[PDB]
Curated annotation (Swiss-Prot):
Notes on the domains: Has 2 domains with the C-terminal tail tucked between them. The C-terminus adopts a modified ferredoxin fold. GvpF from bacteria has an insertion compared to archaea (residues 122-160).
Segments of this protein annotated with the region C-tail: 233-242
Protein name: Gas vesicle protein F
Lineage: superkingdom: Bacteria
Gene Ontology CC, one term: gas vesicle
Localisation per UniProt entry: Gas vesicle
Origin species: Microcystis aeruginosa (strain PCC 7806)
Length: 242
């Protein structure tokens, strides 16, 4: 009535039940457009705000369908409400039909897992500064030399470069042991000050337990030094994009 809430797009039909409640307790259905199944439910608002509850509900809908076997999908970002199916016509989808068929081909059977790594930044900064006596003497004597802004920043560039290598020593262990298990690895910018690594992996669905086993083994190589957050179930937001 008010509109249709869109969760994601699927390369295959979703069976009638599969019974599932979604946003505002509404039942979740499937609609075919160009041989693509649009997972949806009836909206109560035209504009949904991204509250924690609503975000969790959206993700749960996608995960419940994924655990039901429907693992290949382009998950849609939160709060997409269309008024009628006229917003998503056959005419609009036909040009992007090829790109979609192609995305689902590289996605089918595959699975997104992600790893984030945290550490104590202040501790690792102070440890890097005492591993290099040269930089600590230049930093303390940089006043008196009356430097231009470039020379000042260059010193800061040398302070971070030793911290960069400490990260590269940790990060390389992950690349050596986990990248070969994956079809594609995407690395993003760290979101917080203690975060030093934010990577996503496209692995075959069935190879997850072996991947998870390797993660815990690495989490056991490093002690309390690192805080490794591994996610083995999520909609493939990182990889399912045109």
């Amino acid at each position: 009535t008010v509109g249709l809430y869109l969760y994601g797009i699927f390369p295959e039909p979703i069976p009638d039940g599969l019974v599932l409640q979604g946003i505002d307790n509404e039942p979740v259905h499937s609609e075919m457009i160009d041989g693509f199944s649009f997972l949806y439910s009836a909206a109560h608002k035209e504009k949904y705000l991204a509250s924690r509850r609503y975000l969790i509900c959206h993700e749960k809908v996608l995960e419940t369908v994924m655990e039901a076997g429907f693992t290949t999908l382009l998950p849609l970002r939160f709060g997409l409400v269309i008024k009628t199916w006229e917003s998503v016509t056959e005419q609009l989808i036909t040009p992007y039909k090829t790109q979609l068929k192609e995305l689902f081909a590289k996605l089918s059977g595959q699975r997104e897992v992600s790893i984030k790594i945290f550490w104590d930044n202040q501790w690792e900064l102070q440890a890097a500064l005492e591993s290099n006596p040269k930089l600590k003497q230049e930093r303390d004597a940089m006043m008196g030399k009356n430097l231009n802004m470039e020379e000042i920043i260059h010193i800061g560039q040398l302070i971070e470069a030793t911290v960069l290598r400490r990260k590269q020593d940790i990060i390389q262990v992950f690349r050596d042991q986990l990248n070969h298990r994956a079809q594609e690895v995407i690395e993003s910018d760290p979101m917080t000050d203690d975060m030093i690594y934010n990577a996503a992996y496209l692995i075959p669905w069935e190879q997850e337990p072996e991947f998870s086993q390797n993660v815990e083994a690495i989490d056991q190589q490093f002690g309390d030094r690192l805080r490794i957050r591994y996610n083995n179930l999520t909609a493939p937001y990182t990889f399912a994009q045109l």
